[PDB]
């Protein structure tokens, strides 16, 4: 809270092992289905 | 039976986006107009009429089983560019000797693009 | 004051009758009971337009529901407003249509026709100053084709006057829900094209993609399908319930809209719908409505409105509005896109602006368009017709009831005059 | 209302109409004594005492099929006058069972159906379940349907038939019968769905793993195969097909009315738990030859029209996304002069299990009934079997000498012999 | 009904005449606004 | 007023382009939620330019994020910002095209430029006033390449006068992340130079001898090159955005820059970058934002200008300075220094000055140079590329799409031409 | 998406996707009953493994796999072993006589016996993918359904797919040891044949990887499962940028067109460097420059021919785990530089990078080493032009006498395949000379 977003005021979590992409974008009966991501990389809670 | 286009809405129809992921059956993209009366080709209990031409082909669909289906079935892909004239021209030879592959329902729709090196 | 009478034909127009109802018992606040018990005195001034008053202060629908078998009315009273329709308005036989054009014409739709025109003639004569009848059906069935185009034309021979308007549910271009539909498409479009006022034709292709790519529903039904369709139903008749600041009526709808007699057939759509999360994303104003009014991908008729020309358009508005927006977006469509509209007629788009939104949204609006583009489908229906009619398909069960075989020859050679009339107004100078 | 009234005839009737009525009491609530512990109309008729009683009648001539009927766990349900039975046989013969046995039974049936007839307020249609090999299947069933056309007039006869397997039958003297029964039908039937024994015995043995099946574990294939053609005059549908919906989309001409069957999703219930069951995968199903009723293959001829009864929890986009499917393929082939080519019909009451059962608890099903030209080697197959034992007059003094002409033996082979030709040239280009 | 979706049949004809011949009849099942 | 829509192509412009939006935000008081949470009026009052509208006081950008295969779209919609982008904007096929470019041009592009040209035309349609598109991509790819001058072609004959940018990455001259290299690249800078009114060219090694040699950072990801791509997108573009003693749009430095239209391959910088323990150490005057423009070793675009002469010069401040002092260092190099500038332009630089500077930072500068050092990037790609092609190397995943073999011979003379058309000046 | 269909065909086929599909169950959370542990999140929370697990509604995932074979005593472990609920039963095809080392049986009398049974069943597992990136094809040139029958699969698939990406996987035949005696007149009848239908084809051969188990691992005596298990490492690394979060993506499209050049020569050479041991990983660091240099060593290439014998056409460098896109770059600059190492004429660009987030996964009771960076590598060389001079000298040798002729002559098949698919490779001896001339 209260950093700047320039290169160097960001932290990487080294401790992260899971990496994973939701499914946000699928098909549906031929046409294309957006669901909201309720859970970001990694299964980290948006 | 005919495919036809549904016009907004030929996208989610698209072969591949219906999950067939081979070959498949086209559809008509432009439908042909005509007017008045249509004259009935066939008389009664289905018979073709006489002077009616029939076309040559089989009655029943032309359907290339495993024990019918050619021995040394050739490629689908065959681009003859980087190839030597008479190389590309057995492959040609190859493709062109089998006449029965090529028209059947589930034939061999195959592919020659380019030229080769003379 | 200016009743409209409904009538409900074949299965599908039950279930869509069933449907609107229910929507319009929604907007004027009439509980599934009958009960009047609504918030403002706007929900009961022109109640009359669609609802008899009984004793007790109970409000009873005007509409007639025709079938050739209960098996669809059963259904239909077993449903939530089951109970708000009169018992005597529901007509049924004993045996079915079996999807044959020609059972729902002369065999045994001729034994019904007279009950039927009994019932509507009694819900006639109690309007004080009626203007016409509204009728749902589908072109693939024989209770709703036959027997339905067998009402509209002993309607149109007794009540020549009035307003006649069709919802039909014409056939879809890829899949077919009954092998032997384009005798019935071409022997109802014959009679259509002479015995109806308006038609507006219904796609369901068109309502699927609609309820897939902009509502996002993952399972539509047909419990959707029907609300779109009555939504877009109940948006044409709301200048003659409601307040507005530019009214209009069915008459006047037509008067705007067809130029000939022989080219009565529209294209529907609908404005704000819109996805379900998708909310947040989207603005409500009168722009946001027309780019969605008018976008080819929104009309519930499966034919490309850029193959042709719209020979005209209409806009119907519901909502507290500006009308120098209206009038500045309805002009600058057709100056943008000037390949897809007529020339020797120099404004095309007539507006009509209401006050009363639906309930739960801001504004709302719909569009009636009138294109030399809807001909795909009878060229498509004309080629399939002949087809199946050179060989004698399936000829034997339409010939073995009294059909003739030059009704087939004069249905074929009618619709593809329309489709050179058609053709002949789009390459006009 | 929307009755329908059940013919079964022949001990191929009889033992398909114990497996089709023990589903109905049981889909409904109605006991096996008859007491229900309002859409049973179809099928049954309440008495004043209580007690419901089908809407039925079984004939036999021989009396040792259905006195297992009147001793078994159903033998309070059915009324006493609807099971018939004679004294001697028809023995594998069609003159015993058309002209000297069978007419002295004929007379008495006729006044079972027109009592039944008198109660039903909507009557939509006869059903006939007999099978073309026997005696009494065969040629009793040639004298039903020859009488009831000028009795009752335009009503709706569907029939249902054990078609002669192509290697496999019970009898030598099958292809005399197959012949002279399809000849003495032609002009006085509707629709006939055919179905054959091996081709029941290849799915059972192949889709549930029941290898050596009995006729029980087929006449229960059957019923659930009646079971979905009735499906919507009983149960609340969003698409409606009645029995008269038949005759109009599969039947192109009045000499054609030979379509086949097919019910998908026959699946084990150890193998329901690795699959879903989508519209989709039960749709494509249908038309794979693995999976038909008769061993003829749709892909070496052209399809004419198709009828698809889909029942569960069903959608209707997904049923018109996997049509659009089936018309794209080019192994799916149809006839030059049918462009639209489907009849669709959804219900939602989902497919009820049988206690003792062998098909899965499932949640969607599809039961598609289709015309095909490819019926054709199944005639010219019978064709040859019929003249090969023929040419030298085999077989032909049990036919002549009870009250039987020599000459339909000519006639009913000529007759035929157009119909070889008339499959022919409905499918020949313009 | 949610489980069972029976159509009891409300219309028909008696006395030569179309009626409501119920009167008293269920819905899918479970009873109507009449109990 | 001035609207500029974004555009991103492929697995290097769906990287740039999601960091770039991760610098304006923060530049505009955006949260990760896309809310407005600043503290002043100034970011708020241009925000048009790059931001959209939405309901509940809620802003999105103008993004069209295009792939041929969604899977690096998945990682960018992860990210701390994935949720600020209008979801319909995805754009995304089903299978890629393996660094191929007529897969991605002719064969599987095409089948996918008709659904991005509704998503631009739904958004170049809803300005006031569009001033010009941009580009994000990479020229060593298949889908940044390939597609990415199908979408110049495509609209360029739709909107024909208004700006088109792109931001290059042209490939590498020591280690190629891609073997079929110089098919591609000779194939698209031959589409830039009839369709292009600017591009940048950025090459990958430059951006590593500024994090290792400059900035120190002992581990610099993609994320810390992206960084630096993201800090001259938006130097060039501030002055719209942020009030100004001087100003200069998109346009003004384009009359700027190039004397005959054939010309328009520049190479970026940025001054203020300083090394780790070195913050204490820095003298913090205007002179010190000349040094590190100029220095020949902090270009982004791995060609000195020490082989060649600076056609004209851009150069953009962000902070409160002084005009005079300004002025007076453009006086400066160039009358130290004038073995390196033309001589048939008097005054090659132009100068702006925005107020405004990055958060954080006292001052800022940023730079845009047009060399004739810079046609030795377009000599060394043809001679990878003829010598490759003169043994007719991969051709056949080429022509086997059905290309011509004189397609190759002009792409490669267009080329030729314009290191001879660059080569007069010298 | 990014859907794979595997196949796997003969016993070393069977054996080997017991290997790879045991790896894809621990790499993602799926037991050996099919069930994750309970997914414990709302909806479905992880879809990474779509690419070869489907799922059916109850959360039961089925892999994306034929195992095909024609001896019933194969299968038949994987049938009632440990995943024996794993498998979906009919993805498990067996004969009931096998093909006995000929070519001959195997492609014209027993291959098209039981060659449209399978061809039904990689249908239903191609119409469940939205979208499919190609098969995978995993043989032996030795046996007679790993020859005979597997190029009688890729002919087949020619016709009914078109140009569908049809990798494959392979067992070429080692120098000094071998299994049987008739190798070579298998191992040249199907080089022949799917010569022009074959996309990419990669070869290990067991020799070289005996010499890797034995010596950079401390595993003396290794077993076909120590090998099994090295070739699901290099098969998961080729499609763990189709998983697992990615810096730079590689599909299964990129290495066709960046290793195969010219029509006739679709022949790459794998390679896997940090195959180490866990008494000698607790001394060296592994960096990124450390296991770059290791593809490229003579010692732990896996074939046994030398690529410094000959020029490198192209390479495709697949680096996994705790990486820098930058000194990715600083050992690529460096590996360039060595004129040990010699790149042929016309590639002067030469590599393909993919970098990828997840480290390898340890099995437990495995080989390996916990190691934090790995690089996988398939690169395409004219040192093979050597290995086929092996096999021209052991096809003539046993030919001119005709040894053996008669098991095929009279096995469905003519005589004159013989002496034209010598012929044809005698043109691709020559083939691979004219690559390697300097264009002077």
Same mark, same amino acid.
């Given at each position: 809270?209260? &950093?700047?977003? &320039?290169?160097?005021?960001?932290?990487?979590?080294?401790?992260?092992?899971?990496?994973?992409?939701?499914?946000? &974008?699928?098909?549906?009966?031929?046409?294309?289905?957006?669901?909201?991501?309720?859970?970001?990389?990694?299964?980290?809670? &948006? | 039976?005919?495919?036809?286009?549904?016009?907004?809405?030929?996208?989610?129809?698209?072969?591949?986006?219906?999950?067939?992921?081979?070959?498949?059956?086209?559809? !008509?993209?432009?439908?042909?107009?005509?007017?008045?009366?249509?004259?009935?080709? *066939?008389?009664?209990?289905?018979?073709?009429?006489?002077?009616?031409?029939?076309?040559?082909?089989?009655?029943?669909?032309?359907?290339?089983?495993?024990?019918?289906?050619?021995? %040394?079935?050739?490629?689908? !892909?065959?681009?003859?560019?980087?190839?030597?004239?008479?190389? *590309?021209?057995?492959?040609?030879?190859?493709?062109? !000797?089998?006449?029965?592959?090529?028209?059947?329902?589930?034939?061999?729709?195959?592919?020659?693009?380019? %030229?080769?090196?003379? | 004051?200016?009743?409209?009478?409904?009538?409900?034909? $074949?299965?599908?127009?039950?279930?869509?009758?069933?449907?609107?109802?229910?929507?319009?018992?929604?907007?004027?606040?009439?509980?599934?009971?009958?009960?009047?018990?609504?918030?403002?005195?706007?929900?009961?001034?022109?109640?009359?337009?669609?609802?008899?008053?009984?004793?007790?202060?109970?409000?009873?629908?005007? /509409?007639?529901?025709?079938?050739?078998?209960?098996?669809?009315?059963?259904?239909?009273?077993? +449903?939530?407003?089951?109970?708000?329709?009169?018992?005597?308005?529901?007509?049924? $036989?004993?045996?079915?249509?079996?999807?044959?054009?020609?059972?729902?014409?002369?065999?045994?739709?001729?034994?019904?026709?007279?009950?039927?025109?009994?019932?509507?003639?009694?819900? /006639?004569?109690?309007?004080?100053?009626?203007?016409?009848?509204?009728?749902?059906?589908?072109?693939?069935?024989?209770?709703?084709?036959?027997? $339905?185009?067998?009402?509209?034309?002993?309607?149109?021979?007794?009540?020549?006057?009035?307003?006649?308007?069709?919802?039909?549910?014409?056939?879809?271009?890829?899949?077919?829900?009954?092998?032997?539909?384009?005798?019935?498409?071409?022997?109802?479009?014959?009679?259509?094209?002479?015995?109806?006022?308006?038609?507006?034709?219904?796609?369901?292709?068109?309502?699927?993609?609609?309820?897939?790519?902009?509502?996002?529903?993952?399972?539509?039904?047909?419990?959707?399908?029907?609300?779109?369709?009555?939504?877009?139903?109940? +948006?044409?008749?709301?200048?003659?319930?409601?307040?507005?600041?530019?009214?209009?009526?069915?008459?006047?709808?037509?008067?705007?809209?067809?130029?000939?007699?022989?080219?009565?057939?529209?294209?529907?759509?609908?404005?704000?719908?819109?996805?379900?999360?998708?909310?947040?994303?989207?603005?409500?104003?009168?722009?946001?409505?027309?780019?969605?009014?008018?976008?080819?991908?929104?009309?519930?008729?499966?034919?490309?409105?850029?193959?042709?020309?719209?020979?005209?358009?209409?806009?119907?508005?519901?909502?507290?509005?500006?009308?120098?927006?209206?009038?500045?977006?309805?002009?600058?469509?057709?100056?943008?896109?000037?390949?897809?509209?007529?020339?020797?007629?120099?404004?095309?788009?007539?507006?009509?602006?209401?006050?009363?939104?639906?309930? $739960?949204?801001?504004?709302?609006?719909?569009?009636?368009?009138?294109?030399?583009?809807?001909?795909?489908?009878?060229?498509?229906?004309?080629?399939?017709?002949?087809?199946?009619?050179?060989?004698?398909?399936?000829?034997?069960?339409?010939?073995?009831?009294?059909?003739?075989?030059?009704?087939?020859?004069?249905?074929?050679?009618?619709?593809?005059?329309?489709?050179?009339?058609?053709?002949?107004?789009?390459? /006009?100078? | 209302?929307?009755?329908?009234?059940?013919?079964?005839?022949?001990?191929?009737?009889?033992?398909?109409?114990?497996?089709?009525?023990?589903?109905?009491?049981?889909?409904?609530?109605?006991?096996?004594?008859?007491?229900?512990?309002?859409? #049973?109309?179809?099928?049954?008729?309440?008495?004043?005492?209580?007690?419901?009683?089908?809407?039925?009648? #079984?004939?036999?001539?021989?009396?040792?099929?259905?006195? =297992?009927?009147?001793?078994?766990?159903?033998?309070?349900?059915?009324?006493?006058?609807?099971?018939?039975?004679?004294? =001697?046989? @028809?023995?594998?013969?069609?003159?015993?069972?058309?002209?000297?046995?069978?007419?002295?039974?004929?007379?008495?049936?006729?006044?079972?159906?027109?009592?039944?007839?008198?109660?039903?307020?909507?009557?939509?249609?006869?059903?006939?379940?007999?099978?073309?090999?026997?005696?009494?299947?065969?040629?009793?069933?040639?004298?039903?349907?020859?009488?009831?056309?000028?009795?009752?007039?335009?009503?709706?006869?569907?029939?249902?038939?054990?078609?002669?397997?192509?290697?496999?039958?019970?009898?030598?003297?099958?292809?005399?019968?197959?012949?002279?029964?399809?000849?003495?039908?032609?002009?006085?039937?509707?629709?006939?769905?055919?179905?054959?024994?091996?081709?029941?015995?290849?799915?059972?043995?192949?889709?549930?793993?029941?290898?050596?099946?009995?006729?029980?574990?087929?006449?229960?294939?059957?019923?659930?195969?009646?079971?979905?053609?009735?499906?919507?005059?009983?149960?609340?549908?969003?698409?409606?097909?009645?029995?008269? =919906? #038949?005759?109009?989309?599969?039947?192109?001409?009045?000499?054609?009315?030979?379509?086949?069957?097919?019910? @998908?999703?026959?699946?084990?219930? =150890?193998?329901?738990?690795?699959?879903?069951?989508?519209? @989709?995968?039960?749709?494509?199903?249908?038309?794979?030859?693995?999976?038909?009723?008769?061993?003829?293959?749709?892909?070496?001829?052209?399809?004419?029209?198709?009828?698809?009864?889909?029942?569960?929890?069903?959608?209707?986009?997904?049923?018109?996304?996997?049509?659009?499917?089936?018309?794209?393929?080019?192994?799916?082939?149809?006839?030059?002069?049918?462009?639209?080519?489907?009849?669709?019909?959804?219900?939602?009451?989902?497919?009820?299990?049988?206690?003792?059962?062998?098909?899965?608890?499932?949640?969607?099903?599809?039961?598609?009934?289709?015309?095909?030209?490819?019926?054709?080697?199944?005639?010219?197959?019978?064709?040859?079997?019929?003249?090969?034992?023929?040419?030298?007059?085999?077989?032909?003094?049990?036919?002549?000498?009870?009250?039987?002409?020599?000459?339909? #033996?000519?006639?009913?082979?000529?007759?035929?012999? @157009?119909?070889?030709?008339?499959?022919?040239?409905?499918?020949?280009?313009? | 009904?949610?489980?069972?979706?029976?159509?009891?049949?409300?219309?028909?004809?008696?006395?030569?005449?179309?009626?409501?011949?119920?009167?008293?009849?269920?819905?899918?099942?479970?009873?109507?606004?009449?109990?």
């Amino acid at each position: 809270h209260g &950093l700047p977003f &320039l290169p160097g005021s960001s932290f990487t979590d080294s401790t992260k092992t899971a990496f994973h992409r939701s499914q946000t &974008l699928n098909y549906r009966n031929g046409y294309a289905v957006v669901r909201r991501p309720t859970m970001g990389i990694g299964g980290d809670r &948006l | 039976a005919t495919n036809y286009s549904a016009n907004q809405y030929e996208k989610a129809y698209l072969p591949t986006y219906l999950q067939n992921w081979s070959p498949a059956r086209p559809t !008509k993209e432009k439908i042909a107009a005509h007017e008045g009366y249509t004259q009935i080709i *066939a008389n009664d209990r289905g018979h073709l009429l006489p002077s009616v031409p029939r076309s040559k082909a089989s009655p029943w669909g032309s359907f290339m089983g495993t024990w019918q289906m050619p021995l %040394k079935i050739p490629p689908a !892909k065959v681009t003859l560019t980087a190839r030597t004239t008479t190389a *590309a021209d057995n492959l040609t030879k190859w493709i062109h !000797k089998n006449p029965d592959l090529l028209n059947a329902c589930n034939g061999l729709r195959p592919e020659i693009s380019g %030229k080769p090196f003379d | 004051m200016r009743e409209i009478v409904h009538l409900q034909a $074949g299965q599908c127009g039950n279930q869509i009758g069933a449907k609107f109802w229910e929507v319009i018992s929604d907007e004027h606040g009439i509980d599934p009971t009958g009960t009047y018990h609504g918030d403002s005195d706007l929900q009961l001034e022109r109640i009359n337009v669609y609802y008899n008053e009984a004793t007790g202060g109970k409000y009873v629908p005007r /509409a007639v529901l025709v079938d050739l078998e209960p098996g669809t009315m059963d259904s239909v009273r077993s +449903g939530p407003f089951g109970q708000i329709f009169r018992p005597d308005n529901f007509v049924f $036989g004993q045996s079915g249509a079996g999807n044959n054009w020609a059972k729902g014409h002369y065999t045994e739709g001729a034994e019904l026709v007279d009950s039927v025109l009994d019932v509507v003639r009694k819900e /006639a004569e109690s309007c004080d100053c009626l203007q016409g009848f509204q009728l749902t059906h589908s072109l693939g069935g024989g209770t709703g084709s036959g027997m $339905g185009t067998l009402l509209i034309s002993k309607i149109r021979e007794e009540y020549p006057d009035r307003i006649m308007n069709t919802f039909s549910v014409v056939p879809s271009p890829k899949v077919s829900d009954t092998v032997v539909e384009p005798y019935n498409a071409t022997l109802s479009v014959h009679q259509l094209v002479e015995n109806t006022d308006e038609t507006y034709c219904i796609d369901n292709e068109a309502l699927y993609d609609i309820c897939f790519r902009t509502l996002k529903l993952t399972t539509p039904t047909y419990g959707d399908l029907n609300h779109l369709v009555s939504a877009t139903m109940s +948006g044409v008749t709301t200048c003659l319930r409601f307040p507005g600041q530019l009214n209009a009526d069915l008459r006047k709808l037509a008067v705007n809209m067809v130029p000939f007699p022989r080219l009565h057939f529209f294209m529907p759509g609908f404005a704000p719908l819109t996805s379900r999360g998708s909310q947040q994303y989207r603005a409500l104003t009168v722009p946001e409505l027309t780019q969605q009014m008018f976008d080819a991908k929104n009309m519930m008729a499966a034919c490309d409105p850029r193959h042709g020309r719209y020979l005209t358009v209409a806009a119907v508005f519901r909502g507290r509005m500006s009308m120098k927006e209206v009038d500045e977006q309805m002009l600058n469509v057709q100056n943008k896109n000037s390949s897809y509209f007529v020339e020797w007629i120099p404004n095309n788009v007539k507006t009509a602006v209401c006050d009363i939104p639906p309930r $739960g949204l801001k504004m709302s609006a719909t569009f009636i368009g009138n294109s030399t583009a809807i001909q795909e489908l009878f060229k498509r229906i004309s080629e399939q017709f002949t087809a199946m009619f050179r060989r004698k398909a399936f000829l034997h069960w339409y010939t073995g009831e009294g059909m003739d075989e030059m009704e087939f020859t004069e249905a074929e050679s009618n619709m593809n005059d329309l489709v050179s009339e058609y053709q002949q107004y789009q390459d /006009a100078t | 209302m929307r009755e329908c009234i059940s013919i079964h005839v022949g001990q191929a009737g009889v033992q398909i109409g114990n497996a089709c009525w023990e589903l109905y009491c049981l889909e409904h609530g109605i006991q096996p004594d008859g007491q229900m512990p309002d859409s #049973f109309n179809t099928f049954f008729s309440e008495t004043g005492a209580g007690k419901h009683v089908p809407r039925a009648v #079984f004939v036999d001539l021989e009396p040792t099929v259905i006195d =297992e009927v009147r001793t078994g766990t159903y033998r309070q349900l059915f009324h006493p006058e609807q099971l018939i039975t004679g004294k =001697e046989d @028809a023995a594998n013969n069609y003159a015993r069972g058309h002209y000297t046995i069978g007419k002295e039974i004929i007379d008495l049936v006729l006044d079972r159906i027109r009592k039944l007839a008198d109660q039903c307020t909507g009557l939509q249609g006869f059903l006939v379940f007999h099978s073309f090999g026997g005696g009494t299947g065969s040629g009793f069933t040639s004298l039903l349907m020859e009488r009831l056309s000028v009795d009752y007039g335009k009503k709706s006869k569907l029939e249902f038939s054990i078609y002669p397997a192509p290697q496999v039958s019970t009898a030598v003297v099958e292809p005399y019968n197959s012949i002279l029964t399809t000849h003495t039908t032609l002009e006085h039937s509707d629709c006939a769905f055919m179905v054959d024994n091996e081709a029941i015995y290849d799915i059972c043995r192949r889709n549930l793993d029941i290898e050596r099946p009995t006729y029980t574990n087929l006449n229960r294939l059957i019923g659930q195969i009646v079971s979905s053609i009735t499906a919507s005059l009983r149960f609340d549908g969003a698409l409606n097909v009645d029995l008269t =919906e #038949f005759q109009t989309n599969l039947v192109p001409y009045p000499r054609i009315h030979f379509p086949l069957a097919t019910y @998908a999703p026959v699946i084990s219930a =150890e193998k329901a738990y690795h699959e879903q069951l989508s519209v @989709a995968e039960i749709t494509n199903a249908c038309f794979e030859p693995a999976n038909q009723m008769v061993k003829c293959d749709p892909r070496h001829g052209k399809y004419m029209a198709c009828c698809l009864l889909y029942r569960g929890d069903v959608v209707p986009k997904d049923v018109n996304a996997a049509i659009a499917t089936i018309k794209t393929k080019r192994t799916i082939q149809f006839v030059d002069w049918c462009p639209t080519g489907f009849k669709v019909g959804i219900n939602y009451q989902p497919p009820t299990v049988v206690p003792g059962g062998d098909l899965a608890k499932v949640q969607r099903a599809v039961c598609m009934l289709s015309n095909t030209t490819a019926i054709a080697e199944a005639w010219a197959r019978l064709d040859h079997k019929f003249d090969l034992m023929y040419a030298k007059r085999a077989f032909v003094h049990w036919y002549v000498g009870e009250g039987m002409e020599e000459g339909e #033996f000519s006639e009913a082979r000529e007759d035929m012999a @157009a119909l070889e030709k008339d499959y022919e040239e409905v499918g020949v280009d313009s | 009904g949610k489980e069972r979706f029976h159509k009891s049949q409300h219309w028909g004809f008696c006395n030569n005449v179309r009626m409501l011949v119920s009167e008293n009849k269920p819905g899918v099942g479970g009873d109507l606004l009449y109990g």
